[PDB]
A paper describes a structure:
The initial cycle of elongation is catalysed by FabH, involving condensation of malonyl-ACP and acetyl-CoA, while subsequent cycles of elongation are performed by FabB or FabF. The active site of all three enzymes consists of a catalytic triad centred around a cysteine residue, with FabB and FabF enzymes both possessing a Cys/His/His catalytic triad1920, while FabH possesses a Cys/His/Asn catalytic triad2122. Here we describe the crystal structures of the Yersinia pestis β-ketoacyl-ACP synthases FabF and FabH, and compare these with the unpublished, deposited structure of FabB, presenting three promising targets for the development of new antimicrobials to combat MDR Y. pestis strains.
YpFabF crystals displayed P1211 symmetry, with the unit cell parameters a = 74.67, b = 63.91, c = 89.29 Å, α = 90, β = 107.14, c = 90°. Additionally, YpFabF exhibits a similar pattern of dimerisation, with strand β5 of each monomer arranged in an antiparallel fashion, however these β-strands are not positioned to form a contiguous 10-strand β-sheet as observed in YpFabH. The YpFabF monomers are related by a two-fold crystallographic axis with the most prominent interactions occurring between strand β5, helix α7, and the adjoining loop regions (residues ~160–170) of each monomer, with helix α7 (residues ~170–180) and strand β5 (residues 157–158) interacting with this loop and their counterparts on the opposing monomer. In total, this dimer interface buries approximately 18% (~2,890 Å2) of the solvent accessible surface area. Platencin exhibits ~4 fold greater inhibitory activity (IC50 = 16.2 μM) compared with platensimycin23242551, with docking of platencin and platensimycin into the active site of YpFabF and YpFabH showing that the terminal carboxylic acids of platencin and platensimycin form hydrogen bonds with residues His243 and Asn273 of YpFabH, and His304 and His341 of YpFabF.
Numbering used by the authors:
A (entry chain B), B (entry chain A): 2 to 412
Amino acid sequence: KRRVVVTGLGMLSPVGNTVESTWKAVLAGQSGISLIDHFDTSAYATRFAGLVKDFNCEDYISRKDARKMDAFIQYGVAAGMQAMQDAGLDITEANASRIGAAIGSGIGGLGLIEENHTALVNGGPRKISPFFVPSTIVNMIAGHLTIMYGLRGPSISIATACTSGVHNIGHAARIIAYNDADVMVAGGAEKASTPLGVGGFGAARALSTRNDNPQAASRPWDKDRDGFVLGDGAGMMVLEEYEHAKKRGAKIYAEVVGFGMSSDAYHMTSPPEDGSGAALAMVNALRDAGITTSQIGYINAHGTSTPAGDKAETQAVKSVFGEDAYKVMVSSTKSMTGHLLGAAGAVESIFTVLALRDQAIPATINLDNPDEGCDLDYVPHDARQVKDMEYTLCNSFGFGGTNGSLVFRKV
Amino acid sequence: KRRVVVTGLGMLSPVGNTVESTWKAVLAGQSGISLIDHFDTSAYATRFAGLVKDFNCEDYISRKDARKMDAFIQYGVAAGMQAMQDAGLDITEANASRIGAAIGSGIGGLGLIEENHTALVNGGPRKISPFFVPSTIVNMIAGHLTIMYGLRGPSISIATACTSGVHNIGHAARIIAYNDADVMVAGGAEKASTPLGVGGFGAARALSTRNDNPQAASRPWDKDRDGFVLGDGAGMMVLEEYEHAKKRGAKIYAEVVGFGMSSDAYHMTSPPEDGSGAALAMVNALRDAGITTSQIGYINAHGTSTPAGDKAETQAVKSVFGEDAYKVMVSSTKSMTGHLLGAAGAVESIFTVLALRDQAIPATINLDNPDEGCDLDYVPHDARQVKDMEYTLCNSFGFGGTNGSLVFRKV
C-alpha cells in the first residue's frame, strides 16, 4: 500500500497572508472579522465578513492575467504557489506526467459573474468579457497552476460546497495511493463575500446579524449564536507518495492516513439532530486509518456557529467516540476565521497538520456560555499545549448533506 | 480486485427525452440543434443551440421542488431517476450506507444566478430568493437524489468543465473499486443556453455562427467548421460492483475497465497541436485496462467542430494507436447533439456503452469534406453496423486543458 504525506503548505486567510502568520494568529486567538467596505452594505442584514487584507496579487500574478481570473482564482493560484515553493519539487519532463492537481471551490467566480451580467444588461452581449468562462468556472485554479508549473498529471476539481477542501485533499490522496500520481496539489479557495453571496446566504437567514460586535459574532457552541460568519481565503497542500518524498529529501509535515465520506439524505441545508451522516463519515475515516476512537487527540470540528449544526456535530462526536468524547479536544477555528466554504476544509486541514507538528491546539473563541447539550471539551478560550499527540481528525459537513473527514498522523 | 459494471442508464438530450429515444435518433442521424427562444437573441452572433425539447419537470418532481432548482439541476435529477428506475435497486438500511453519488457540472446554475442578480439590482438583497444557494451550486443534483432515495454513501461532484461527465463516472468507479461503496449514480448535467452563457462563449469567439443552417453548423473534421455548437442535457449511470450486480440479478450493460486522466499544461482554452495531453489520457486509460491499442474498436471522440481542437485530437489518436489508427473507427455524436459541456462526457459514455450492446456505431453528420490533415475513418455520413467489438474508448478534452478517457468492455 502506498502511503501519502504532506510535503508543502500554502494559504491565505482572514488572519494572515501566509501559513505561519495565520497559524500564529490562530494560536493567539486573533479575529479576522471586519466590516465590509468594498460594496454598499446599507440594505443588507449582515455587513461583516472574514476578509483577506493587504493582498496584492502582483506578487503572484501580473495584472494583465489577474484581470482574466475572479478573486477566488487569484487566492487559489497564490496559495498554490506558496505550497509549491514550500515543497521544493523539481519538475522535469520525466516527472510532469506524474504531477497533477485537485483544487476546488464551493461557489466560484460569483464576483466576475455579477460584473459581466450588469455589463450584459447595460450594454448587450458584446460588453461581456471574452475571458468570461475561463475566469469564473471552478476548475480554472488547477488550470492555471498546471500550466504555470507544467504539471501534466491528473487534474480534477471537486465542488461540494463546504466539503470541497476536504474532498479534494482526500481524493488527491486516493489518486496518489492508486499510482495515478506521485505528487498532487490539493485544496480549495473561496470568495463569496460579494453582494449576491452575502445577500443569498442572508435571504436564507443562515448568517449572523451581530453587526454591533463583529468579532464576537462567530461563537460556536455558545448560547447566543445566530448563524455562521462568512469568510474568504484559500488553502493548499502538496501531497506526495511517501518514498518519493524521502528519496528527494523533502520536509514532511504529516501523513494522510484516513479519508471517509457520507451523505445525510435528510434535508438540503439543515443537518439531522442525531448527526448520523456526520458520524458515518468519521467512522469511515477511522476504518480507513485502521485506528480506534481512543487514539485521536484533537478534532477540528465543522463548528459553524449555527443553532442546529453545532448541536448535530457534538451528538455525532459522542455517538462515534462514545465517552472518549470528553477526553478528546474539539475546536472550531471558525470562531476566528469565519466560514470559508469551499476553502474551509482545506484551511482547517492545515491547522490539524500544524497542530501535530507544534503539539498545540487552537481555541474556540467567544465560547462564553455552553449550550444545553454541549458538554465536550471545546478548548474554550486559550490554546492548550498537549504532548505525545499523534492523530488528528478534520471535519467538514457541507450543504446538500455532504460529509467528509480526514485523519492525519504525526510523522 | 473489484470490477465495476453499468447496471442503469438515464439521460436527457437535444435529440430525446429518454435513453432509447435518444439512441434511435443518434443511429438515424437526427439533429437536435434548434434556434433559441427563452431569451431575445437579436444582438447575439449565435442564435441556435441543442435544446432539450418538450421537457416538463412536473413529470418527475412537484413544482414547489421544481421552483427551488435551476434548470441544470432539474435535468440532472430527472435523468437520475431514470437511471435509478432502470437499475431496479432495493434500498434498505444496510444497503443505504453502501450507495452514493458522483454527479457534476461544468458551469452549474448560471440561469438562476442571472435571475436573482437582476432581482437584487432592481429591488435589493431582500428580493433575493431564500433558496438562491441551494438552487444554483453544482453539487445539489447529488443532494436531491441522495435525499430522494435515501442514499447515505460517498457523495461528490467533480466540476471540470467539458470533462465533468467522464471524471465523475471514472471516480465513481474508483470509489467502488476502493470499496468505499457498492453502487454509485454518476454523470453530469448542463444548461448553458442562457444569455450570459451564449454571450460568454460568443465573446470568446469559440461558437459557430452558421445561423442560416443551424443543423449543419456542427461539422467536426470538416474544412468549414467554425466552432462548436452549445448543447443542453444530462446523462446518468448507475455503476455497481460485479459480484453485487450478479447476486441480485441485475441488468448488466457493460464493464468499466479503464480510466485515464491528464492535463495539457499549455493554454487555458486552446489545445496543443499534438495530441500530447489527450494522448496521455488515452494511454493511461489503456494501461488501467491492461489492454493494447489493437483491442479497441471505436473511439467516441471529443470532436467539437473547432479548428484547433479537431486537428489536435486526430494527431493524438495517431500517436497512440499507430498502425491501428486507420483500422479504428472514430466518431463524435456532437455533430447532432452539439457540445453539452459537463454532460458531454456522460451522455457520450452512454453512447459508447450502447454501441457495445447493439454493435452499432453512430456516424458524424455534416462530414461533407474532411480537412487536410485528416486521414482517419470518421464514420462519415451513416451509422455503421459492426460485430465482435469488445472495447470502446470515450474521450473528453475540456477547458483548462483537463483531459479524461474511459474504457468500456462488452460483458
